[PDB]
């Protein structure tokens, strides 16, 4: 029981570094989507 409880603490920590590392990459993807707006009507 404690082993499973001990495990759950790391994924709570693990998800914290997951979102921060993805955060820097996310902004680059968002800038690309801006160009799709202008060409959305054209195709």
């Amino acid at each position: 029981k404690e082993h499973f409880r001990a495990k759950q603490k790391e994924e709570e920590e693990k998800l914290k570094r997951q979102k921060d590392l993805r955060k820097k990459l996310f902004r680059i993807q968002g800038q690309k989507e801006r160009r799709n707006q202008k060409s959305s009507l054209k195709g």
């Binding site: 989507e33 707006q37 009507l41």
Partner: protein, 290 residues
Amino acid sequence: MLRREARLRREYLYRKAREEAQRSAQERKERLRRALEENRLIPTELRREALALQGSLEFDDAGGEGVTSHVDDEYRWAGVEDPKVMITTSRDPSSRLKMFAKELKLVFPGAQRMNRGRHEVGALVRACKANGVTDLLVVHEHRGTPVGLIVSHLPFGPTAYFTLCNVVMRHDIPDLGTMSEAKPHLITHGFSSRLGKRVSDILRYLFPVPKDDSHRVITFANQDDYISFRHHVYKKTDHRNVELTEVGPRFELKLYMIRLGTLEQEATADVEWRWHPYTNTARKRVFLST
């Protein structure tokens, strides 16, 4: 008929459970629609399955009933048909309780009062359903003064429990005369919260659609979770000046329980809202207003 009644109840309960899911599905659909109408990013939640919601938007039309509401299912025939109200008392009523029950028949248009003898409660509800009775009222008394009132919507509608506080009847007041008996205008005041809207709906549907020129007014005013019942008739002596003469009984209401089922289903029906007086912050909290 008994099989039909059971089938309709399971249909009603099934729709109630899924009501929240359809509302969320509907809400996601409108956010996509705004994003299409004004050229913008699809929201990241709506980025997947966007085509399916777009396909749904074409299929939506005025013909469909729309999202279901459990309130609408309960009061299906509220506007189209006039309500049928029956009033009864507890077993072996007092002298003054029978006098109070006589006055409540006069207040509600088309209401009927029947003697409670050795009738089982479940048997009473069965007869009311068979003969198309819409709403059933049961009144309790303590030492000759009314103390409790139960309002039940017969077609598996909500049951509301009330306690009466300051009851003054017409029979105590001498030489009043006779009542107007016209279809009354309704005044609802003080109900602002979601629960207050729920309670006011139950009280309002007890009355039929009135006429525009009716001079009969019934007022329900909420003040600190206490509902005041007032009945008045007005005369326009001249423009902008109106005179009010109080007629009919005067009493206060305090709600403490709402149950989904009928009053024959105490052991099975769920409780939509209950008053909790032993809560640590129960003294300083109100529920009928915001």
